[PDB]
């Protein structure tokens with residue numbers, strides 16, 4: 001029964017633009033990482049120790065800072081986003097940043113050993129690394145679950161970049177002024193996504209893929225609340241700010 005409308009010339013364009021935006025902002029070789037402050041892995045096999053040292057924090061904060069800059073760059077090329085006021089652009093970037101970083105990080109995530117593999121052993125990040133950056137299992141374990149859940153959807157790159165764009169252009173972020181315009185931009189991206197799935201995604205029995213992706217968006221909101229709680233406590237550690245970057249302080253402060 002269900003109709004399979006073809007992608008319009010405009011939806012084809014939107015997909016091309018977003019894939020292009022991603023390829024410009026996402027280096028799949030991680031060749032910039034040698035520019036971050038080095039990773040340090042003390043032995044913890046302890047919350048006290050990990051707060052006293054924060055030995056992976058300078059490195060992972062440089063990584064997340066770098067990632068925020070790429071997301072700002074990616075967001076600028078989303079069809080519609082530049083029609084928003086600069087103020088709503090900033091609201092959306094700030095509230096979705098850690099969610100988009102979690103999403104985009106799925107490209108370096110691997111179920112080989114459940115790590116984000118960006119190298120070159122030094123640039124392989126495991127649960128134990130995230131705890132050495134002062135985060136707790138209440139964030140890390142659901143984060144790894146989300147990464148696996150996401151991997152197992154086997155998204156086309158078209159799906160992956162549309163899902164990042166939809167995450168960023170969310171009319172329900174606290175503090176937006178033009179909700180209708182944002183919802184209008186998002187609706188254009190969601191319709192492209194829905195159409196894509198039904199045309200392009202084999203069998204296609206899993207048009208059902210759309211609801212699952214939407215559910216990931218909801219998972220991302222809970223991860224975002226938890227990160228915020230833990231970043232707050234991490235920020236209580238004396239001289240923590242030296243281990244972050246101005247951009248990370250602004251975005252999460």
Ligand SMILES: C[C@@H]1[C@H](O)C=C(C#CC2=CCC[C@@]3(C)[C@@H]2CC[C@@H]3[C@H](C)CCCC(C)(C)O)C[C@H]1O
Nearest residue numbers: 060064067101102104105107108116125130133231
């Ligand atoms: C660079 C590419 C992508 O943007 C992200 C990547 C990653 C990763 C990550 C690897 C280890 C866990 C993370 C550091 C990120 C994903 C988000 C994690 C945490 C929750 C952020 C903590 C931030 C703070 C200390 C400030 O609270 C790798 C590449 O896929």
